[PDB]
Each structure stands twice: as C-alpha cells, then as structure tokens.
Amino acid sequence: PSGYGVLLATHDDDTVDVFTSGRKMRLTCSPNIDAASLKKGQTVRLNEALTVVEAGTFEAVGEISTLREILADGHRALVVGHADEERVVWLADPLIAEDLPDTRPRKLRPGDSLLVDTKAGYAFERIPKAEVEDLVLEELV
Amino acid sequence: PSGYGVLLATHDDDTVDVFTSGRKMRLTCSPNIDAASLKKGQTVRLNEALTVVEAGTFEAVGEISTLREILADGHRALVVGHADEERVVWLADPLIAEDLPDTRPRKLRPGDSLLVDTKAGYAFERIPKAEVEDLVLEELV
Amino acid sequence: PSGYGVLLATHDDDTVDVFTSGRKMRLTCSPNIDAASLKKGQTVRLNEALTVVEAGTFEAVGEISTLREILADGHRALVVGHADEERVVWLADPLIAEDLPDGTRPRKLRPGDSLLVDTKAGYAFERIPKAEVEDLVLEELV
Amino acid sequence: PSGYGVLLATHDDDTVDVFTSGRKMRLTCSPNIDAASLKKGQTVRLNEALTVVEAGTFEAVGEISTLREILADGHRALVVGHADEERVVWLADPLIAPRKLRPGDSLLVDTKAGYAFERIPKAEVEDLVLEELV
Amino acid sequence: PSGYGVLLATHDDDTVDVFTSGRKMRLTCSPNIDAASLKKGQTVRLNEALTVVEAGTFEAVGEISTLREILADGHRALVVGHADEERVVWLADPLIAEDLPTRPRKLRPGDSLLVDTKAGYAFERIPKAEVEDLVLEELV
Amino acid sequence: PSGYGVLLATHDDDTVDVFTSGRKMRLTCSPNIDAASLKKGQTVRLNEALTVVEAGTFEAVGEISTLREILADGHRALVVGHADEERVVWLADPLIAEDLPDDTRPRKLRPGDSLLVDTKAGYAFERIPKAEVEDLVLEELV
Amino acid sequence: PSGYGVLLATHDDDTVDVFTSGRKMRLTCSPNIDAASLKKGQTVRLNEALTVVEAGTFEAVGEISTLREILADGHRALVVGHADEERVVWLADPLIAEDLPTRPRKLRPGDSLLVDTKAGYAFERIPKAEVEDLVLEELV
Amino acid sequence: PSGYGVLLATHDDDTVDVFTSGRKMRLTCSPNIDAASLKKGQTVRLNEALTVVEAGTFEAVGEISTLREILADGHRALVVGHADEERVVWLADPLILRPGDSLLVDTKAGYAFERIPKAEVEDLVLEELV
Amino acid sequence: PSGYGVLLATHDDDTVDVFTSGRKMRLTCSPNIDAASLKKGQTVRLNEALTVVEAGTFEAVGEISTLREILADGHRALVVGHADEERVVWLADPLIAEDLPDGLPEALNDDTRPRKLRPGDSLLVDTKAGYAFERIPKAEVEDLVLEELV
Amino acid sequence: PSGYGVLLATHDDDTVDVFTSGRKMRLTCSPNIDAASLKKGQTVRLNEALTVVEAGTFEAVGEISTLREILADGHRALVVGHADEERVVWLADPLIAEDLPDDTRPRKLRPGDSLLVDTKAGYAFERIPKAEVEDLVLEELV
Amino acid sequence: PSGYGVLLATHDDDTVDVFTSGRKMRLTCSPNIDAASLKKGQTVRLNEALTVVEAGTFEAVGEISTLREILADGHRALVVGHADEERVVWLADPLIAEDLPDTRPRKLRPGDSLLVDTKAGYAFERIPKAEVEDLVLEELV
Amino acid sequence: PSGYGVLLATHDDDTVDVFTSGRKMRLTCSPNIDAASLKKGQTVRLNEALTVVEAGTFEAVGEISTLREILADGHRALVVGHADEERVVWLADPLIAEDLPDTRPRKLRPGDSLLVDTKAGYAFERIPKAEVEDLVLEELV
C-alpha cells in the first residue's frame, strides 16, 4: 500500500515538505527522484516508510474558490470561497508558468475559478466556467 | 472483517487508486479482481492488508449537488451544492458511457441532480426530481 | 466492552454490511443470529473482533430531515435538511412495510413528513409527527 | 486516568449502554456500582479498560436548543437549535422525573449523545437591557 | 513533552477533573500540586502519564461570545455566539471573585467573553472599542 | 519524518510551548537551538520524539480575518472572521516589531487590516494587502 | 350626475359630516333623508350642490388590513396593512353591533377588515381560507 | 367629446353607478340604452352631460394581481398585489377562477376583469434563447 | 357646505394658520371664535369663504408612527413610520400639557391613561398637516395572540 | 396652447379614442388627420377644445419594463416592472408589424426584452437594447 | 385668505421665484417687502393675487433625510432618504452661514439628518438625534 | 405671476414643446425668445396665457439616478433609480456638447450620477460623488 501527499516545497538539502495524512511533514525522496525537478503543488506517492518514491500530476478534483488577487510575491493568491471566506493559498507551478498567454491555459485574472485544497493550502488548476445562457439552453433543448 | 473504498483510478499494473479511511491510497488487487471489468467510481472491498478483494456496485446514498457543467475532459463535472459551494468531481463510468442517449438513463445535462461523495471526489448517479406541485398535492390530499 | 453499528444490508453468505466506527464494513454474524430476518436500518451489537452478536432495534434520537420523495426503487428517499441540504438516505424496513395503511400512528410516508435520520450511516428510521404551531403556541401561553 | 461517558440504558446482565469517545458502547460495571440506581443521561466515570466505576450527576454546560414538543412516548423531545436545525433527543431523568416542560423552553442539550438535561430559564430582554445600560 | 488541560473540578483524593485532548478526564496530581488552591478554569500542565504537574494561568486566546445573563447558581453563564448559537458555560473563578467592584468589574449582560466551547468555560472579559474610534484610526 | 508546529512561548528553562498535532504542548529544544532567539508565532520543526529540532519562518498560507482592534496588552488582537465570528489571537512578533513605521510594505497594524490567522493555534502572522476592487475588475475585464 | 361620500357624523341641526372628494365636509341633508337612521360609515349620495340626497349601504370593495386590536373606546381599531403600515380607523356601525355573536361575529385580533384609509373607516370582516385549503384548490 | 367609465352596478330606476374621472358617480342612461342589459364591469361611453350613451367591452390593460379566493357571495374576490397588498374587488360579469390565478384588475374602480394565462417560464426562457 | 382644517398656529390679529385642502393657509376667524380657547392641532371648520367658523376636537383616525424623541424646543417630535421613514411633526397641545403625570408603575400592567410621552410611544399623526394628536396604547402581542387562538 | 395624448383606437366617424389628461376620451379629428394612416400607440396633438389636430411619432422617454410574454391575441403583453409589478399593456403597432425579422436592429419581440412603457396609457412603444454590463464597466473604469 | 410659499430666488426687478401650490412661480412683492433681504429657503406669505406680502421663518416640520455631501458650489446637498432614494436639494441660508462653528447649531457634516421638503427641493434645518441607548433607558426606566 | 416649464423640443414655426403643470404642451414663443439660442432641457418661463416669455438655465435640484448607458441615438440615456427602476430620459444639450473632453465638465460615462426629472423625462447635470471613505472621515474628524 502507498499513500499520497502534495509537495509543498523542496529544500536545498534535498528533503521536501509534503502535505499528507492531514499535516505537513519533512520527508526524503528515494534515489529514483530528482527533488529539484519536482513541481510546487505536485502530487507525490509515498511508501509505507513515508519516502517519496514517485511524483505524479496535480489534484484534479475538490473545492473551487474565486481568485481575488495574486500577492506581491507572485507565488500566493488571495481566494474567496463559497460563503465569502477568504484564504491565502500557494499557486501550483503550472498556474504561474512564465510561458502562459495573457478554456485554453492563460495567465490568471481576478475572478478566475481555482481548484483549491484548503488543508494543503494550494491552488492547482483554473476551471473555466461556461456562460449560464449556454448551459440553460443545453438544459432546456 | 472487510473495509470498503471508492475506486478512483486503475493503473497498467494491477494496482488501483482507492479512497478509503478518508484518504487516497494506491492498493494492490487480488486475483479475484478482473481489472478489465473495473469501473471508475466503483465501490471496492478491502481485506485487512488493504488488498482489493472484490469489486462492487456504486455508492447509493449521500449528498446531492446540482450539475453546472461537464468539464472539457468529459470525465469531471462542476457541481454546486446546498449553500452554493462549488466543487469539481469525477464522473463515475456509467454516467458518461458512450451508449447513453441524449426517469431513465441518459446523458447528463446542466441542472441535473447528482449523488456525490465530496471526500472521494466522485458523482455516482443522476437523481430525478418530481415536480413540487405533484409532491405538494401528494402531501395535502 | 462492545460497540454498535447500523445494519446496511445482508448478503447471500451471512456476512452483513454494517456502518460502525464512522465507516462501512462487511462483518460476520455469529451462528446465534438468524441473519435472514435482520431488518435494514437495525442496530446490531458487535464484539471486540467485529462479529455481529446481537440484533437490537433502531436509532431513536438524531437529526430530523423533511421527506421530499421516495425514489423509484421504493427503498431510498430524497430528504431536505435544516439548511436546504438535500441527501439520498435508505429507508429502514419498518418505514416501507407493505402492510402500512396510508392516511400520529404508523402509516405510509408522504412528502413533507419529518424523518429521524443518520446522515453518516445514510438511513432514515422513523417518522416524527409535528404538532400544529398554534396548538404549541397555545400551550406555551396557557 | 479515567474518562467519562453519558449513561444511555441499563441491561439485566450487569452491563450499561454508554456514549463515550464519540460512540455508543456496551460497558460492564464494577462491583461498587449500584446498577439499579443508575439514571438515564447520568454522567458515569470509566476506567482504562472502559469499565463503569462511578456514577456522577448530569452535564451542566453545553449547547442550548429550544423545545418544540415532547414526543408521544414522553421520553423524547423534538428540539430546534440555532440554525433552525431540528433534532430528537432523550430526556434525562430530571426532565421526566419540578415543572412540566412547555414549548418554547430552553434546554441544555448534548447532540452527540442525544440527550437533554436541564431547563435553562431566560430573563426578559428588557431587564437584561436595563442591567447593561443603567 | 508535556500537554495541557483546563481544570474543571477538584476531588479530595489528589485527583482533579481536567478537559484535555478533547475530553473530560479525572487525573492524578503530583505532590507538587496544591489542588485545593487551584482555580476553576485554570490551565494545568500534564506529563506523559497524564498526571497534573503544574498550574498555569488561563486560556488567553480563542472565540468570543456575548454574555446574555449569569445563571441563578452564579457560576454558569448563558452566552450567545456569532451565529446566534446559545450555550451555557462555567465562569472561570476570577470572573466571579467577590473582590470585583475599562478594567476589572462584575459582569453585565452584553459583555464579550473569551470562551472555550469544547471545555465549556469563559475566562476573560474582552473590552471592545467604539467602532467610530476604530474607523477614525483606520482612515487617518 | 519530521512534523511542524507553531511556537507560542519560550520559558526560562529553555523548553517552549508549541501548537502541534491540534494541541498545545511544552516541548524541549535541541541544544543547537538558541531558544531565547525564537520569535512568538515562529514555525518550528519537531522530530518524532517531539523535540524541537529547527526554527523556521512563519505560516504563509491559510485563513484571512479582519483586524478589529489590538488589545490593551499590545500582544493580542480581536479579529473578525468571514461569518462575523469574533476571536482573540496572539500577534506573531513581526506584526508588532517596535521598528515598524505607520501600503504593500511593512507597517504597524490598523483596524480593518486583513491578517493571515491560524485559529487553532490562535495566532496571526502576516498583514495581507488588498488591492482596490476597481483595479482588479479592470484587470479581469482588460 | 350625483357623487358619493362616507357618513362620518350627524349633528343636532340635521347637517352631517361626510368624507367626499378626498376631504371632510359638513353638509346639509335633503328633506328626503331620515337623519336619525343614518349609520356611521354608511355611504351617502350627494347632488351637484353637495346636499346629501340618499343614504346607501357600506363600501364593499377596497383595501384589506389586519385587526391588531380594538381601542379602549370600542369604536376605533388599530389595523396593520400590507407593509406593516399601522393605522387607526373608526368601526362602521355593523362591525360593533351589540347583538353580535364565515358568518357574522365579534372581531378578534388577526381578523381581516375591509378599510378605506382616506375616510378612516373599517366596514366589513373578510374571512380568509387556510392556505392548504387554497393550495389544494389551486393544485387540483 | 366623450369620456368613459366602468359600469359598477345598475339601479331599478334605470340609473347606473359608474366609476369615471377617478370617482363613483350615479349616472343616467340615454333612451338607446337598456340599463338592465348592461354588464358589471363593462366599459361605458359618456357624453358631455355624463349620460351613458354607449356600452362596450371590458378594460383590457392594467395591473395584474393574484387571486387568493372568491368571497362567499360569489361576486367579490380577495386579490394580492405585487407588494403583497391585499384588496377586495368586484368580479366583472365574465368572471362571476382558482386560487393563484392572475387577474387584470383596476384597483381604483375596484374591479377584476379578465384572467390572464401565464406560460411556463422554461418555455419563455427557451424562446428568449433559441 | 363647510370644510375643515387643522389649526397650526394662532395669532393676535384674529387670524390663524390652518392646514386645509392640502396646504397651509392664513385664515381669518369669525368673532364667534374664542382665541383663548384654541389649541394647536385642533380641527376647525371653515365656511365657503375660508373663514374659521368653529373650533372642534382633534383628528382621531389616521396613520400611526413611533416616537423617537421630542426635540429640544419641546413642541416637535421626531417620529418613525412603517418603512422606517423619519419625520418631524408638531405635538398637539394636550400631548405636552404641563400637568401630565409620569404614568402608573408598570407593575400595574396598565398604560391607557394620559401621561408624558416617552420614546417608543405610538402616536396618531397627520403627515400632510405635520401634527401628532394622540398617544395610542398597544396591547402586548401575547395577549392578542391569546385572544386570537382561544 | 396644445396638449397631447396617446392614440388608442380609430372609428369610421372621424373620432378616435385617446388617452390624455390621465383619462380615456373619444375625440373628434380635424380633417388634417389621415385616420387611415394612424397607428395604435401614436402620439396625437390636441387643441384647447380637445379636437385632434395633428398625429406624431411615439413616446420616446419613460419607464422601462421587461417583457414576460405576448398574450394570445398578439396585441397585448404581460410586462414586469422594477419591483416585480406585473401589468398587461397594448403593443404599439410598429412593435408587432408582420415584416419584422427574427441587438440594436429592429426585430420580433422575445421574452426578456426591455420595453419603454407608459403604464397610465397602458402601452409599450419601443424595444430598448441593453449593452453588456462588462462593456459598460470597462467604459466606466477606463 | 393668504397662502404660503418657499422663497427660491430674488430678481433685480424685485420679483421673486417662490415654490407654492406645488409649482415654481415668479411672483411680485408688495412695496413693504425688501426683496433683496429675503433668504433662500425662507417662508413667504402670499395674498390672493399671489403677491408676496410678508417674510417668515423656515419650514419646521416634514421629512427627514441624511446628508451625504455638500456639492462643490456650497449651496446644494446630496441627501439620502428613507428608502435610499438620493436627491439634490438647495440648502436654506442659515444652514450654510459662514460664521457657524464646526444639539447646538454648527457646520453640516456627512451623516447629519436634515429636515427637507423634496417638492420645493430645499433642506431647512439640522435635526439632532439622541443616542438610542439614552432613548431606550428613557423608554425602560 | 408667471410659471415655469422644461423645454422639451423646438419646432421650425417658433413654437416649442414644454413640460409644465405635469404635462407636455405645445406653446407659442414671444419675441423676447431667441429661438436660435434655446437648449433642450432648459427652464422656460411662461405667462398666464401659457406663452413662453423668457428662457432660463436648467433644473438644479431633484432626483438622482445612475447612468447605465447612452442610447444609440446619442440623445437619450437609460438610467437606473433608487429601487432599480429603469427609465429612458432625454439628455439636456450641455450634457452632450460636442466640445466635451474625457468636478469639471466631461463626456458622460456609465456609473455617473445624473440629476433627473422623471415627469419631464430629462437629465440635466452630472453630479459628482465623493468616495465614501472621505465622507466618513469628514463626519468623524
């Protein structure tokens, strides 16, 4: 049996901070893994000893919140959840890639919907929203 | 005793991603399992070593949310729950089977009520809803 | 010491699905239990090894939700909770007993009925009658 | 160290149902315990092995809900909490066994164990306002 | 490593009731502890065995609720929280000291109290500034 | 593996109070920690024995609440959460640095500031600037 | 062409106070009128000269307000309208007839009254069906 | 020039009550008019002397209110306006209806004239969007 | 035919201010009018020439508003109406009589007799004329509910 | 001085029904009036004797209401006003002309359209196009 | 009989604009009126011919609105009524006298309650409001 | 005495449409009137026979609504009032003067607050609004 976590950060000593089992843990990576090529926000698989033995993609299901703004450091966002609760979260590396254009991937804007994991403290993906007129037609026709 | 889980994903190695005991795990399948017959969203039975020993049906009780839209990938849905909380969930395999036509089974449309499990991140079943006046008539008569 | 669970379903083999310790488990009965006659929704007692050793009655206290409708299969209901949260629950066997009269005393269920429910185990157990607010208000005043 | 639980029911076998650690459990009592004299809803103390070793009074602090009505059986009550959440609870010994309860009464409840314990009187808002303002 | 708890009640056999790790426990005190000088609501320190080994002050951070009224027994209060959820709590000893005549006084309806709703305790009256003064301070 | 916690207070016997695993604990530091050099609210790393093995920065993600007022002691603040829940929290040492002036750059707190808070640990860590909504909407619409 | 008004009072000189054309007036009555038998709240017909020439019944259509309570004097009521507007109105003679017991009876708080808020009168109790009875009739 | 009114009721002397120019008036009819054949709620045309000289149909535009219930007499209805304002109106001749029905009313004249059907909103939204 | 108005103010030239036909008018009085018996807020009757011919009682029906406070001059009140509309009105003379008592202790649960006004009192008002005329006592809602339901 | 009214109907006797001075009247036309070419809802000019002396265009300012539906007869519409007040109004001739195509362009009416109405006269005159709020706010902010 | 009006402006021919009988009118003044010493917002009395024959004080009863701001010209104000209706009104002359200090007369500030006549388009008087807690005491004592 | 009205439109015959006494009328203009210089929305003065005898400026007090958009014709505006009541009004000529740039005069933008007379169906003036926080400071300082 393997468990999973979210990669929060890598350290120059090659250990990593991982969110797993409901908490933040400093863990090591098996020799199969180049800790320096891991991506912030990335899903990692953990063996029974909590060694990181494989890096995967990103959380793809969960809570959606609305981006208010990206903070001055470029790596955190202030997000607004369903009952107006505001939170700060880290932006997973793919959200802030320098080569995004400003339904296709693009640079984030205020009002964008973000898939977030509030316990790990991360945003992973921009979720496009179709126009309500288009959805309703599709419901009604 | 046996435990249970939701099958999240299958892998090309006779292991599977399962959500059980409130967490996502990569588990081995027993010889009883015909990993060709396995359906995303399916209930699985786990023995005490956390081996998947049997494939079951689908969760049939739990929370209802409203479908807003199926994501571009065709395997995930944006649903809106009781307090306008929005979430992305995976669609169980029968909800999206190609042979569904567009009461009884059909392709999903915006506005449909879906039985969901928000911890596991899955919708399982479309729940039809009677017209309120029919129900109120049934109450009052 | 012993724990308890809610009987979710019985199988071909005298094992049962039980909701206990916050989760769904397939458990064995002891030979002393006619597993055939166990009722869906029923409280069962478990020993320390999780064997089901005794059959009880039904959860009697808990959250109330309003019945919207019984689903097509006749064994599940869509219920609406206190903040308009909607859920599908299984109906305990007594609730859907074919020998119930329709139309205070036991009767068939209708939309608008208040049901005692356990949303973790995912069951409704009992219809809870409600007095008219004016009779209650009257009793509060006189 | 010992823990605590709420007494739910007794059995003619020397065991009691107790709500403890967030769950209903069937527990044995110690020889010191007068099972006969135990009260519904009573606090009991439990040892490490989870034996009931002492009977206490009743929960005295906790959430408040409003009594809508006592059910027909006279042992349960339909109560309405703060977000209009409705629930059925057992009435502890002191609430069935001293003025009868009336709709509108405020009751001290434990919604996990499913018990009401005590009627809590409420001052008139205007008397409280004078006490705040004078 | 040591843990902590809120003192609920004292017994005459060198044990006390303490709310710790989410639940009410009856725990032994070390010889160090003068148990009948403890105060209701007081923080206690627990060793690995759950023996009480030191007395501290009082919870100083947490949820705030509004006092509705002190109950007839004079030791419990009816308080109302953010979403109008009502609760009965015990008053920590110094909130009801016979000493009491801003700064320290007897409690009145409408006072804001620091509470721990899991332990069932109020610890402190938290004064509130006038919103007009705060807004001035925000805008100037 | 090592876990983490929030530094609540230091004592003069060089143990520290730390919030970790959902509760307040008194913990010993490794001799390699300069314990009077620790700051209130600081993140610390803990080994499995629960010794403090390293001192860090401060929580940087989490819930936001609005500052109502700093209490008389200068070390706690009354904050107001998303559904008007009110709480008292400690202020992490950087929030209250005596060399702090009175934007998007560090300054002393004012009522109505947004603060990153951890309501379980009962601490505030960082002032979070908010842009003007009309600027944000323009960036959304442009 | 004749107009109409609401009878407000009769005087000793057989003139009458009438609410007509949006205002209160003191008017003479025709030899045709039995000024004694006119009833307060009663409709009267007025000729172009504004002489009262005929007595009628009572307004039968109009706004409906909820009785809060009959005032101390027994001839006025405090009524509550659609957006909680509260008014005092006079009770037309038939509403407080001393022989009173969906059929005539004495007024209770909560009753719906047909009112003319300009003239300041209530005229008629209007029975209301229970909503479930009406919803049933709507539904079927 | 002529004016118009709403026929409110007829009298056995062949005169009528008409709501015209914002008020209730008792008017006479011309010899051409059979007053006994006029219908409650009917529009009448008036000459300069305020004689009823011609009968018409019924008001066709106006405020809509929701029927709560018809009164026991069968001639009046209790209706609820948009801001939950309740009133009693007379029923025009064609209406003398189920609770919840939408009715064209003239609250000054105190009459309901016509039941107004409403399409299902989902049929309307489709027609907005297709 | 005679009309009516509300007496707003008296003067010593045999004229009064009156609110009538929707507006404030300065009207002469018949010598039958005793200027030392006129009370601000009272109803007066006017002849066809708009001479004040008789002086009467007070408006007894109309809109109710809640007293917030009597203003510093002692003669006007700030009142609050149904949709939270706030207005200033003159107080009719009897509402502010020097000899009005405080009122029975509430332990007597009776508030029907005339007393000095207090914030929260219900006042009968005419917002066109700008006058309050009478304090309207209100029963407790529980008694009214009792009378409705028993 | 002349006043004005809204044309309601024509008759074959050189008179027309007109809504003027807050009421419906039957008025004679001067021979200048080409009654054949009058359109329901049209403005007309009246002399001091209330003779119709000239015919105009249509009211061009006033209240806006939302079209719910055209009634069965095709000449009246149920409209919903600002506070959800519902009314039936007549449709001015041009709004229902048979040569309307199915924006800023002239077309057949649809539920959801904003109509200029005169609720006294009981007419709708004109469909008023609405810009998208995003475009307006952009215009506001830049 | 005499009527009354609100003085709006004076002209150099000693005629005046007056709001009376629900309309703005231009009226002449009797020889005894010093039209140049009239104040904006002042009550004037009018004979049957609609000549201004006496100047008075200011309207003392009516609708209360809340001052939002004084406009740039210093002579008009934007006020907010009971249903959040906004309007601009003229300020009667005493409201804006230069010698007013900044219960007792003073310079106007946002949030002040003004006695207004919305038909005439004028604000006349600042109405002080007691603290609700002092009024409650007075009510409860 | 004279009355006043709002100039709605001018004709080539030296007559004008004017809103006065709560209605639209077509009146005759006297020789004191330079038709060349008359502005849509302007206040005019009327004698007792209802001749226009003088041209004034513009209504300066009254209701305020928010501009939603200027209609395609460029002379009419869709405005939204205190209870979100929407209306069409004409814009007085100075509001749309061709020399207007982008407190001081400029072209209108959505969101601007306009002084309106909903009976006459005209907007007259852009009324600036201060930021609430500046107003609250002024209230408290």
DSSP letter string, B54-123: EE-----SEEEEEEEEE-TTSSEEEEE-TTS-EEEEEEPGGGS-TT----------TT-EEEEETTTTEE
Question: Exposed e or buried b for every residue in C97-106, given b needs 16+ CB within 10 A?
Answer: eeeeeeeeee
Q: Give the long-range contacts of residues K7-16, CB within 8 A, separation 24 or more.
A: K7/K38, K7/K39, K7/K40, K7/K41, K7/K42, K7/K43, K7/K44, K7/K52, K7/K55, K8/K40, K8/K90, K8/K120, K9/K40, K10/K35, K10/K36, K10/K38, K11/K35, K16/K44, K16/K52
Tell the burial category of J142 from Cβ atoms under 10 Å away from its Cβ (0-12, 13-18, 19+): exposed
Tell the burial category of L139 from Cβ atoms under 10 Å away from its Cβ (0-12, 13-18, 19+): middle
CA–CA dist K13, G73 (Å, integer): 59
Going by DSSP bridges, is the β-strand pair D86-91/D115-119 parallel, antiparallel, or unpaired? parallel
C-beta separation of A114 from A66 below 8 A:
yes
Q: Return the axis-axis angle of helices D125-133 and K132-140, rounded to nearest 10°.
A: 120
C-beta separation of E114 from E51 below 8 A:
no
Q: Which two structure tokens, joined as six digits, stand for G102?
A: 């969906």
CA–CA dist K121, K90 (Å, integer): 6
Q: Return the axis-axis angle of helices I141-149 and C133-141, rounded to nearest 10°.
A: 120
Nearest to F60 by CA among F34, F41, F79, F37: F41
Q: Report resolution in angstroms.
A: 2.0
Q: Tell me the helix, strand and coil percentages in chain G, rounded to 5.
A: 10, 45, 45
**Start-to-end C-alpha separation, chain L:** 47
Torsional class of D117: left (φ above 0), alpha (ψ -120 to 50), beta (otherwise): alpha
CA–CA dist F110, F70 (Å, integer): 8
CA–CA dist D88, J110 (Å, integer): 52
Where do we find the tokens 């921009």? Answer: A126
C-beta separation of H79 from H59 below 8 A:
no
Going by DSSP bridges, is the β-strand pair A122-127/A86-91 parallel, antiparallel, or unpaired? parallel
C94 SS3 class:
helix
Where do we find the tokens 């300066």? Answer: L60
- Identify whether residues L106 and L69 lie together within a single domain: yes
B137 Cβ under 8 Å from any chain G Cβ: yes
Q: Which two structure tokens, joined as six digits, stand for F139?
A: 């960036």
DSSP state of J103: -
The answer to whether D129 contacts K136, with C-beta atoms less than 8 Å apart, is: yes
Beta strands (DSSP E) in D11-122 are: 15-20, 23-28, 43-46, 52-55, 62-70, 76-80, 86-91, 106-110, 115-119
CA–CA dist F132, F103 (Å, integer): 12
C-beta separation of D33 from D75 below 8 A:
no
DSSP state of H84: S
Residue B119's CB is within 10 A of a number of other CB atoms, namely 12
C-beta separation of E103 from E109 below 8 A:
no
Where do we find the tokens 């103010």? Answer: I9
Backbone angles phi, psi at K41, to 5 degrees: 95, -10
Strand partners, G18: G7, G25
E42 SS3 class:
strand
Tell me the nearest-neighbour CA distance from A126 into chain B, angstroms. 11
DSSP state of C30: P
Number of domains making up chain B: 2
Distance, CA of E87 to chain centre: 14
Where do we find the tokens 């009640």? Answer: E9
Q: What separation in angstroms does the CA of B31 have from each of B18, B25, D56, K2?
A: 17, 19, 55, 108
Beta strands (DSSP E) in chain L are: 2-10, 15-20, 23-28, 43-46, 52-55, 62-70, 76-80, 86-91, 113-117, 122-127
**What is the per-residue DSSP string for J19-41?**
EETTEEEEEEBPTT--GGG--TT
C53 Cβ under 8 Å from any chain B Cβ: no
Q: What is the dihedral of CA E9, E12, E14, E16, to 10 degrees?
A: -10
CA–CA dist C120, C126 (Å, integer): 16
C-beta separation of A76 from A70 below 8 A:
yes
- Identify whether residues H107 and H68 lie together within a single domain: yes
DSSP state of D92: P
Tell me the nearest-neighbour CA distance from F74 into chain A, angstroms. 25
CA–CA dist B70, G140 (Å, integer): 38
Where do we find the tokens 């005759």? Answer: L28
- Identify whether residues E51 and E72 lie together within a single domain: no
- Identify whether residues J94 and J50 lie together within a single domain: no
I59 SS3 class:
coil
Which residues numbered 101-120 in C keep a CB inside 8 Å of some CB on B? 110-112
Backbone angles phi, psi at F94, to 5 degrees: -55, -30
Q: What is the CA radius of gyration of chain C?
A: 17
DSSP state of H103: E
Question: Exposed e or buried b for every residue in H53-88, given b needs 16+ CB within 10 A?
Answer: bbbeebbbbbbbbbbbbbbeeeebbbbbbbeebbbb
CA–CA dist J112, J82 (Å, integer): 13
Tell me the nearest-neighbour CA distance from E140 into chain D, angstroms. 31
D65 SS3 class:
strand
- Identify whether residues I95 and I70 lie together within a single domain: yes
Q: What separation in angstroms does the CA of B30 have from each of B9, B20, B53, C16, J113?
A: 16, 17, 5, 21, 63
Q: Which two structure tokens, joined as six digits, stand for G22?
A: 């949006």
Tell me the nearest-neighbour CA distance from D131 into chain E, angstroms. 7
CA–CA dist K76, K73 (Å, integer): 7
Q: Tell me the helix, strand and coil percentages in chain A, rounded to 5.
A: 10, 40, 50
Which of E19, E86, E91, E116 has the highest number of chain D CBs within 10 A, making it the mutation to test binding with D? E86
Backbone angles phi, psi at E6, to 5 degrees: -110, 130
Q: Which two structure tokens, joined as six digits, stand for L140?
A: 């408290």
**H48: nearest CA in chain G?**
G1
Nearest to G27 by CA among G48, G52, G3, G58: G52
- Identify whether residues B37 and B68 lie together within a single domain: no
What length does chain B have?
A: 141
- Which of C37, C58, C79 represents a domain boundary (last residue)? C58
Backbone angles phi, psi at J81, to 5 degrees: -90, -170
CB-based contacts of D31: which residues, under 8 Å, 6+ apart?
A: none
Q: What is the CA radius of gyration of chain K?
A: 17
Question: Among B82, B128, B139, whose Cβ lies nearest the Cβ of C111?
Answer: B139
Q: Which two structure tokens, joined as six digits, stand for B45?
A: 């039975």
The answer to whether G69 contacts I138, with C-beta atoms less than 8 Å apart, is: yes
Q: Which chains touch E (3 or more CB pairs under 8 A)?
A: D, F, L
CA–CA dist B17, F7 (Å, integer): 37
C-beta separation of B42 from B55 below 8 A:
yes
Where do we find the tokens 């539904």? Answer: G139
CB-based contacts of F19: which residues, under 8 Å, 6+ apart?
A: F5, F6, F8, F25, F118, F120, F121, F122, F123
- Identify whether residues L53 and L115 lie together within a single domain: no
Distance, CA of D99 to chain centre: 17
Q: What separation in angstroms does the CA of G91 have from each of A73, B99, G10?
A: 74, 73, 16
Where do we find the tokens 């008629």? Answer: G124
Torsional class of H108: left (φ above 0), alpha (ψ -120 to 50), beta (otherwise): alpha
The answer to whether E61 contacts F76, with C-beta atoms less than 8 Å apart, is: yes
- Identify whether residues F118 and F138 lie together within a single domain: yes
G137 SS3 class:
helix
Tell the burial category of K139 from Cβ atoms under 10 Å away from its Cβ (0-12, 13-18, 19+): middle
DSSP state of D13: T
CA–CA dist E31, E23 (Å, integer): 24
Nearest to D25 by CA among C47, L129, B45: C47
C-beta separation of L87 from L68 below 8 A:
no
Q: Which two structure tokens, joined as six digits, stand for C75?
A: 């064994």
Q: What separation in angstroms does the CA of G128 have from each of B85, B137, F16, H69, H78?
A: 41, 21, 72, 8, 9
CA–CA dist B131, D25 (Å, integer): 43
C-beta separation of H53 from H33 below 8 A:
yes
- The CA angle A48-A51-A52, to the nearest 5 degrees, is 120
CA–CA dist B77, B66 (Å, integer): 10
What length does chain H have?
A: 130
DSSP state of I29: B
Residue C90's CB is within 10 A of a number of other CB atoms, namely 22
Alpha helices in chain J (DSSP H): 93-96, 133-141
DSSP state of I110: -
C-beta separation of G125 from G115 below 8 A:
no
E125 SS3 class:
strand
Question: Among A27, A78, A85, whose Cβ lies nearest the Cβ of F128?
Answer: A78
The answer to whether D132 contacts E120, with C-beta atoms less than 8 Å apart, is: no
C-beta separation of E70 from E18 below 8 A:
no
The answer to whether H126 contacts A137, with C-beta atoms less than 8 Å apart, is: yes
Nearest to L53 by CA among A41, B7, J91, K15: K15
Which of H69, H107, H118 has the highest number of chain G CBs within 10 A, making it the mutation to test binding with G? H69
Our answer on whether I and L touch (3+ beta-carbon pairs < 8 Å) is no
CB-based contacts of K22: which residues, under 8 Å, 6+ apart?
A: K119
C-beta separation of G79 from G87 below 8 A:
yes
The answer to whether H86 contacts G102, with C-beta atoms less than 8 Å apart, is: no
CA–CA dist J94, J41 (Å, integer): 9
CA–CA dist A5, G140 (Å, integer): 58
CATH number, domain of K127, equals 2.40.50.140
- Identify whether residues D96 and D41 lie together within a single domain: no
G131 Cβ under 8 Å from any chain B Cβ: no
Strand partners, G81: none
- Identify whether residues L80 and L137 lie together within a single domain: yes
Torsional class of J33: left (φ above 0), alpha (ψ -120 to 50), beta (otherwise): beta
**What is the per-residue DSSP string for E68-89?**
EEE-TTSSEEEEE-TTS-EEEE
- Identify whether residues J54 and J114 lie together within a single domain: no
**Structural domain range at position G67:** 59-140
C-beta separation of C80 from C86 below 8 A:
yes
The answer to whether J60 contacts L76, with C-beta atoms less than 8 Å apart, is: yes
Where do we find the tokens 């007022």? Answer: F69
CA–CA dist A46, A30 (Å, integer): 10
C-beta separation of J117 from J6 below 8 A:
no
- Identify whether residues B76 and B65 lie together within a single domain: yes
DSSP state of H74: S
Question: Among F24, F71, F84, whose Cβ lies nearest the Cβ of E82?
Answer: F84
C-beta separation of A64 from A114 below 8 A:
yes
C-beta separation of J17 from J24 below 8 A:
yes
Distance, CA of C45 to chain centre: 16
Backbone angles phi, psi at J115, to 5 degrees: -115, 135
Q: Which two structure tokens, joined as six digits, stand for D13?
A: 């076998």
Helix (H) or strand (E) run with residue A133 in it:
helix A132-140
Which residues numbered 30-49 in A keep a CB inside 8 Å of some CB on B? 45
Our answer on whether C and D touch (3+ beta-carbon pairs < 8 Å) is yes
Nearest to K38 by CA among K64, K5, K61, K2: K5
Where do we find the tokens 């007025």? Answer: G46
